[PDB]
Amino acid sequence: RSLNRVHLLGRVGQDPVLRNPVTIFSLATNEMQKTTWHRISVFRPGLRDVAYQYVKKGSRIYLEGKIDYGEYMDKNNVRRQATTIIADNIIF
Amino acid sequence: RSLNRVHLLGRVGQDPVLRNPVTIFSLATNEMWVSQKTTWHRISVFRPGLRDVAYQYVKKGSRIYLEGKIDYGEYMDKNNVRRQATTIIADNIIF
């Protein structure tokens, strides 16, 4: 076995979007300003609708998941879309 | 106040490399379910004691646990802003 775990607690940028559907929204995380923006995806079949329904613009949550390294093309070379795939979400 | 912390435990892919200096190696994480899937991470250490400890010790093939934060490296090409993800690490523990 391996481990690939992430924990994030921050404010959501915008209302979620639904794009094997998938809820996609972003998340800000601060240092002291450094702000780090995360691309969040939820594929899981329950939390997926929960997080669509109830996660909103500017809301503060905690999530756990795993990082997933997407990898796409711009003109035939190999560029990096980095996503955080969430297994669990904790709402305020 | 926020929170960006990550935990990974995996095999190192090649002997590390040094480069405000920084040590840089790569980790593999395997998800199994018999099927397999591997995720390759760009690890980078700053903190000064850890950094030379990793460098002296972390070697191609080692099983290692660590923790750190996510950093989406922003760089540019033909002046379009792109990304290199790195996992910037606060600590490691060896097998």
Side-chain angles (χ1 to χ4, degrees):
Chain A
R1 332 273 268 96
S2 247
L3 238 228
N4 190 336
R5 217 65 188 141
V6 189
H7 304 107
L8 265 38
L9 191 148
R11 309 225 76 108
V12 168
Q14 239 93 44
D15 305 358
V17 178
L18 243 336
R19 271 198 337 218
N20 67 344
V22 75
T23 290
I24 270 300
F25 70 97
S26 46
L27 182 90
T29 247
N30 296 85
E31 280 196 298
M32 344 220 67
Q33 276 191 121
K34 193 80 158 38
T35 130
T36 281
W37 279 105
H38 294 75
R39 333 210 0 273
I40 304 300
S41 314
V42 186
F43 284 102
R44 246 220 166 198
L47 218 210
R48 194 188 20 181
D49 326 292
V50 162
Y52 182 54
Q53 203 101 95
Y54 288 111
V55 185
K56 299 291 197 234
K57 193 346 215 239
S59 73
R60 191 165 206 198
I61 359 239
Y62 168 87
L63 62 318
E64 300 160 20
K66 64 184 170 182
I67 171 167
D68 189 84
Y69 296 111
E71 340 126 68
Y72 79 97
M73 221 84 357
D74 69 5
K75 256 114 248 139
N76 212 216
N77 86 71
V78 121
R79 206 148 249 63
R80 168 173 255 38
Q81 222 186 301
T83 197
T84 279
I85 292 188
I86 252 55
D88 165 40
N89 222 294
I90 291 194
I91 206 123
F92 328 154
Chain B
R1 271 188 74 194
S2 59
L3 194 260
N4 169 13
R5 188 112 305 232
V6 181
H7 306 130
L8 276 11
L9 188 149
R11 299 264 166 200
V12 183
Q14 235 285 290
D15 310 303
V17 146
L18 180 108
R19 260 209 357 203
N20 26 96
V22 284
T23 299
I24 275 191
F25 52 109
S26 88
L27 257 190
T29 264
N30 253 87
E31 229 174 336
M32 314 196 327
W33 72 85
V34 73
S35 294
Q36 239 194 303
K37 184 215 195 315
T38 128
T39 301
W40 285 94
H41 299 103
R42 150 147 321 289
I43 308 294
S44 102
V45 216
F46 293 92
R47 247 169 45 179
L50 235 192
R51 172 254 315 271
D52 287 275
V53 185
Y55 174 153
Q56 227 253 92
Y57 286 109
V58 195
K59 212 98 42 35
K60 167 142 123 280
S62 265
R63 207 173 191 203
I64 273 291
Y65 174 86
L66 74 69
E67 306 176 340
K69 55 173 166 240
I70 307 270
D71 167 68
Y72 301 118
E74 161 161 345
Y75 73 88
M76 290 232 247
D77 55 20
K78 55 183 350 305
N79 272 26
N80 113 75
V81 298
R82 298 304 192 178
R83 113 157 23 133
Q84 279 161 210
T86 195
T87 280
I88 288 172
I89 207 185
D91 179 46
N92 323 179
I93 282 166
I94 319 265
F95 335 133

